Amino acid sequence: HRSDAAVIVVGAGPAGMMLAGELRLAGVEVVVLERLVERTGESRGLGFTARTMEVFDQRGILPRFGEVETSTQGHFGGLPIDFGVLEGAWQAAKTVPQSVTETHLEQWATGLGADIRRGHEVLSLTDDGAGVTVEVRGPEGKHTLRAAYLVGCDGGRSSVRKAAGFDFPGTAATMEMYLADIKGVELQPRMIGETLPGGMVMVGPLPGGITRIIVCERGTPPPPSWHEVADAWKRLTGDDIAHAEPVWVSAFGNATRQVTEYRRGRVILAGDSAHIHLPAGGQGMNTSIQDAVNLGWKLGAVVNGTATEELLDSYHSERHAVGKRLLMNTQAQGLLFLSGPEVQPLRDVLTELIQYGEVARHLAGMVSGLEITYDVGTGSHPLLGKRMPALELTTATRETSSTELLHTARGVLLDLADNPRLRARAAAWSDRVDIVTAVPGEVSATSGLRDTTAVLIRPDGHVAWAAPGSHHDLPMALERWFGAPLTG
Amino acid sequence: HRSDAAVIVVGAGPAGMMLAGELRLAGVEVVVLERLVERTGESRGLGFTARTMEVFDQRGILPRFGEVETSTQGHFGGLPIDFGVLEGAWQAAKTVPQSVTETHLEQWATGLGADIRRGHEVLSLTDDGAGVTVEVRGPEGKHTLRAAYLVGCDGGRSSVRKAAGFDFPGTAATMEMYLADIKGVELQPRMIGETLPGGMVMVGPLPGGITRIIVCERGTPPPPSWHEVADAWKRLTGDDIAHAEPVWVSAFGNATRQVTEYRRGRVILAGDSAHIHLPAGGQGMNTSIQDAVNLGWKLGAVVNGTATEELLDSYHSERHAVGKRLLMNTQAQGLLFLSGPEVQPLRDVLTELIQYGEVARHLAGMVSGLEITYDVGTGSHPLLGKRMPALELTTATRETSSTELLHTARGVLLDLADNPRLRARAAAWSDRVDIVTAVPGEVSATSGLRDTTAVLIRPDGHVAWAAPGSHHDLPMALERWFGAPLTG
Ligand SMILES: Cc1cc2nc3c(=O)[nH]c(=O)nc-3n(C[C@H](O)[C@H](O)[C@H](O)COP(=O)(O)OP(=O)(O)OC[C@H]3O[C@@H](n4cnc5c(N)ncnc54)[C@H](O)[C@@H]3O)c2cc1C
Ligand SMILES: Cc1cc2nc3c(=O)[nH]c(=O)nc-3n(C[C@H](O)[C@H](O)[C@H](O)COP(=O)(O)OP(=O)(O)OC[C@H]3O[C@@H](n4cnc5c(N)ncnc54)[C@H](O)[C@@H]3O)c2cc1C
Ligand SMILES: [Zn+2]
Ligand SMILES: [Zn+2]
Numbered sequence: 010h011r012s013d014a015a016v017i018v019v020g021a022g023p024a025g026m027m028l029a030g031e032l033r034l035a036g037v038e039v040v041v042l043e044r045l046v047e048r049t050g051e052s053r054g055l056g057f058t059a060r061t062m063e064v065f066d067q068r069g070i071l072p073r074f075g076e077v078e079t080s081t082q083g084h085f086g087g088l089p090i091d092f093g094v095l096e097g098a099w100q101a102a103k104t105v106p107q108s109v110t111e112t113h114l115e116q117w118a119t120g121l122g123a124d125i126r127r128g129h130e131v132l133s134l135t136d137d138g139a140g141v142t143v144e145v146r147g148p149e150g151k152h153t154l155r156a157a158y159l160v161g162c163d164g165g166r167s168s169v170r171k172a173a174g175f176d177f178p179g180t181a182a183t184m185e186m187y188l189a190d191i192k193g194v195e196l197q198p199r200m201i202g203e204t205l206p207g208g209m210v211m212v213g214p215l216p217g218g219i220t221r222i223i224v225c226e227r228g229t230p231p232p233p234s235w236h237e238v239a240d241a242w243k244r245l246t247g248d249d250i251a252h253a254e255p256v257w258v259s260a261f262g263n264a265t266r267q268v269t270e271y272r273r274g275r276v277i278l279a280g281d282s283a284h285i286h287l288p289a290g291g292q293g294m295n296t297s298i299q300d301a302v303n304l305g306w307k308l309g310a311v312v313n314g315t316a317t318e319e320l321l322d323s324y325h326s327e328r329h330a331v332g333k334r335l336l337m338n339t340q341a342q343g344l345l346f347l348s349g350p351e352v353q354p355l356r357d358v359l360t361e362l363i364q365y366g367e368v369a370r371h372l373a374g375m376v377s378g379l380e381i382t383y384d385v386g387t388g389s390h391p392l393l394g395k396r397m398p399a400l401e402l403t404t405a406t407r408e409t410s411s412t413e414l415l416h417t418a419r420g421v422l423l424d425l426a427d428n429p430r431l432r433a434r435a436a437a438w439s440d441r442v443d444i445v446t447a448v449p450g451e452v453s454a455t456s457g458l459r460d461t462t463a464v465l466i467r468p469d470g471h472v473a474w475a476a477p478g479s480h481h482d483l484p485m486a487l488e489r490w491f492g493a494p495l496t497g
Numbered sequence: 498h499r500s501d502a503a504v505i506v507v508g509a510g511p512a513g514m515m516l517a518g519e520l521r522l523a524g525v526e527v528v529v530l531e532r533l534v535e536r537t538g539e540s541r542g543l544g545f546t547a548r549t550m551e552v553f554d555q556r557g558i559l560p561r562f563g564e565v566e567t568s569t570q571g572h573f574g575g576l577p578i579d580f581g582v583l584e585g586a587w588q589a590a591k592t593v594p595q596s597v598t599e600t601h602l603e604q605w606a607t608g609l610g611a612d613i614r615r616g617h618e619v620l621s622l623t624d625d626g627a628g629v630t631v632e633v634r635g636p637e638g639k640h641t642l643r644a645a646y647l648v649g650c651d652g653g654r655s656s657v658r659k660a661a662g663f664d665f666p667g668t669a670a671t672m673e674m675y676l677a678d679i680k681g682v683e684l685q686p687r688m689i690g691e692t693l694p695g696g697m698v699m700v701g702p703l704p705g706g707i708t709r710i711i712v713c714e715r716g717t718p719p720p721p722s723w724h725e726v727a728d729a730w731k732r733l734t735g736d737d738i739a740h741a742e743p744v745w746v747s748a749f750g751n752a753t754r755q756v757t758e759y760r761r762g763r764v765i766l767a768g769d770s771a772h773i774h775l776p777a778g779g780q781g782m783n784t785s786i787q788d789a790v791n792l793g794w795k796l797g798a799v800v801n802g803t804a805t806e807e808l809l810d811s812y813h814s815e816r817h818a819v820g821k822r823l824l825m826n827t828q829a830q831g832l833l834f835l836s837g838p839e840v841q842p843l844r845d846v847l848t849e850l851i852q853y854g855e856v857a858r859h860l861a862g863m864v865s866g867l868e869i870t871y872d873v874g875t876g877s878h879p880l881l882g883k884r885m886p887a888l889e890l891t892t893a894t895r896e897t898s899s900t901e902l903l904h905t906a907r908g909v910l911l912d913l914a915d916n917p918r919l920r921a922r923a924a925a926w927s928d929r930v931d932i933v934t935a936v937p938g939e940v941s942a943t944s945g946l947r948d949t950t951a952v953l954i955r956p957d958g959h960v961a962w963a964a965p966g967s968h969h970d971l972p973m974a975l976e977r978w979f980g981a982p983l984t985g
Contacts, residue, residue: 340842354828
């Protein structure tokens with residue numbers, strides 16, 4: 010297989026596998042180097058957000074998952090919120106283990122022709138502005154690979170970040186917590202957590218008679234034996250579970266850091282390699298998958314020569330902003346979860362505020378990722394920069410949807426008012442952008458789609474331009490996200 | 498003067514002086530015992546809330562103050578909020594020193610015939626269910642006084658609370674802060690506070706070239722020399738102010754406690770004696786004055802024999818609830834003010850939430866006291882249990898207002914639709930309740946007064962009943978707050 014690719018991805022976690030699939034959709038030759046021979050089989054995370062559900066759906070990935078339980082029951086820092094107040098938030102997957110999601114993403118990417126090389130550890134890396142050479146240890150021993158670009162999707166302790174000179178400011182961990190998947194004992198469920206006099210606790214069932222416990226005890230300084238975790242449980246809850254059978258026991262911290270640059274030269278980061286934090290609020294995997302979704306189409310266009318690196322710079326500006334918000338979100342939730350009775354007054358105030366619809370929707374927007382808004386220029390149209398909500402469509406020949414039209418990761422221009430001029434203005438981008446004339450289905454008052462005659466949708470599903478109500482014109486938007494018009 | 502009164506009040510702070518005046522309005526003989534010969538001349542507090550302004554106005558107290566600067570600029574935990582989003586919140590006094598407010602309340606109460614005995618310290622107290630005897634040291638030496646009821650308005654370190662067996666649960670102080678009024682140096686104002694890397698700081702001007710500083714430095718364990726306060730300033734701000742002239746230097750803490758019972762037998766508490774907390778958010782004096790306003794008319798009715806002690810029990814239930822909220826409010830604000838960078842994520846979330854009108858109004862309601870709602874029974878009418886907003890009124894003979902009609906601290910029944918039956922239904926309470934037929938002025942959509950035909954207003958200004966939309970009937974409300982109907 011040896012020696013060259015267009016893009017090398019380090020790491021086959023959720024970020025790397027989603028990225029690999031996205032690059033394949035862009036027609037890019039991609040090699041993934043993963044040190045592990047076999048998926049860790051972990052599933053620290055359970056379920057995924059409504060926005061993650063949507064980014065899967067828009068690539069036609071969901072049938073791989075079969076029937077998936079969804080839920081509108083949410084929380085913020087353990088404060089319950091009905092996320093059903095926010096349109097589309099219902100799409101959150103409740104229970105799917107991270108290992109299962111990873112499996113489907115790997116199978117998808119591989120099916121698309123990603124060259125995934127397991128048992129290959131990147132030991133080091135080099136970048137001169139022509140390319141990136143990595144040294145790798147595989148089954149064949151030590152060897153080198155070179156590509157135009159290298160993406161570190163190699164996790165919170167990223168070799169790539171360390172080697173490629175990224176600055177990683179933030180705060181050092183101040184506490185160690187535990188999780189344990191266990192058998193034998195039946196415990197009273199606490200799906201959104203339980204505030205205790207000396208900390209916090211989560212309890213929940215998993216298939217095969219497994220109970221998952223999350224143990225966050227007061228005053229613990231930052232692989233754990235089961236009995237210290239049991240001892241932590243006993244002190245917190247008063248209940249002895251030392252007799253249980255430990256399936257998996259793990260430790261984690263609250264170190265919170267983010268790279269100042271998502272790209273240095275030809276070396277880019279996506280996922281935990283760019284941002285680490287307390288895993289509070291079910292955000293890390295979701296954000297990491299979504300980093301890859303932002304990146305893949307852009308890096309693909311650059312590799313394909315259809316876009317300049319101005320486009321590539323927008324991965325940094327858009328995702329650094331999301332990552333900053335991620336750190337705020339998780340730190341805020343962590344404070345509410347983990348601080349003692351001291352923080353109760355603030356829990357109580359926030360609880361009162363949650364009773365207002367705008368607050369419930371605000372927090373739901375933050376947790377679900379449905380709030381995410383990119384700078385695509387100004388205008389009155391409510392959807393600018395936001396994700397395109399699912400929209401049913403009837404064309405001259407078929408019934409389809411915005412979601413389905415995104416399966417090939419192209420741009421999509423919806424002509425919702427049969428305007429042939431619109432079709433002609435954009436025809437110079439028709440090699441990169443599918444121009445679809447359709448009658449739209451019924452849309453809600455709050456969807457942002459009422460009275461909309463046209464929408465330009467980026468390959469990631471975000472709205473770049475809409476009519477009416479964009480200050481920038483359509484060709485400006487097409488040029489910004491798709492590059493130069495075709496020469497007639 | 499010696500030996501007897503109907504009610505003895507211990508302490509001539511804001512609570513005791515407001516209470517004394519309220520009892521006089523009820524026609525009650527009241528003796529106030531205050532240990533200090535001369536007002537401390539302190540003014541820890543500056544200005545007062547919109548609700549305090551209203552409770553002064555409704556007794557015709559305001560002319561004593563002359564022209565008073567008001568402001569809509571508020572904050573919650575140092576997060577700025579335009580309180581102007583909430584009707585009536587504009588009435589907050591910005592700068593009036595606590596010592597000035599105390600002076601006017603003392604002059605008012607004395608003018609009304611309160612017997613205030615300064616240099617009289619209550620050393621001890623006794624209660625058998627017939628009365629309360631106190632031993633007192635005055636200029637004449639040691640002597641005893643007896644009355645039907647005793648009210649401890651004797652501050653955070655209440656002798657009365659300690660002696661009368663009140664339970665005072667809460668949390669012990671965990672930090673010591675400083676304040677200093679100083680001359681000589683001109684400092685950049687920070688009227689709502691300034692978050693620093695090692696704490697928080699407030700700076701503001703006062704008449705006579707005085708700058709007030711509030712110094713809350715990281716890691717200080719719970720009379721201070723000026724130079725330790727200057728040293729605290731220097732470490733926090735980097736600025737040397739040791740050369741300044743200290744006018745007053747004071748220490749305070751964040752001990753947060755509340756009595757479980759506002760009344761035990763014939764011994765009642767009002768003010769700091771019932772509740773202590775961090776003085777964050779300008780709440781203590783305001784709540785203490787407002788405790789007295791709740792109590793005075795009720796205790797007066799009991800002394801006058803027109804009400805039973807069920808009425809007296811409602812002082813506990815109503816004000817314990819307000820005091821609980823006070824502890825929540827001040828603790829929440831204190832956390833936001835005083836915690837390090839660690840709490841920044843929560844400041845940032847709350848800042849986003851404050852941009853929603855319902856949130857801004859919610860927080861403004863809490864800080865101003867305009868939110869305060871008592872259990873007076875159920876119904877759809879929006880004002881039940883809440884304060885009566887100022888309402889202009891034209892009667893057959895005069896132009897008046899709800900505010901003016903409350904000057905004598907009687908009940909007020911507003912007949913806003915010329916309904917003579919209403920007048921007859923309530924006539925049996927006309928000895929205690931002024932029944933006023935009037936054409937109401939213009940009222941706002943949000944005042945709660947639109948389409949209101951009648952309102953029963955308690956002597957404290959709270960709405961007990963309204964038409965339409967009360968589940969309880971008018972006689973039920975009259976009986977509940979005013980006692981038995983007159984026998985024809
Ligand atoms: C207790 C816990 C609970 C969590 N719960 C949730 C949740 O509920 N929801 C949610 O969204 N997120 C959750 N997360 C976060 C989530 O698991 C991570 O954010 C996610 O795994 C990050 O994905 P990634 O692809 O960026 O990195 P990883 O998943 O860590 O993948 C990194 C990969 O790179 C490989 N690698 C490293 N170095 C090299 C090298 N030199 N050469 C080749 N390969 C290399 C590693 O073997 C690894 O497979 C949780 C995390 C924890 C710890
Ligand atoms: C630094 C600081 C800033 C503050 N800022 C504000 C603010 O901005 N806004 C606000 O609303 N509040 C503020 N407060 C709170 C406010 O000052 C108090 O809540 C208020 O003084 C309480 O009033 P009181 O009548 O209940 O008790 P006090 O004002 O303390 O009155 C108690 C009186 O009882 C007397 N006494 C005690 N024992 C006896 C006895 N045995 N016999 C006779 N007399 C006795 C004392 O001499 C005293 O005069 C602040 C407090 C501090 C410390
Ligand atoms: Zn190989
Ligand atoms: Zn005397």
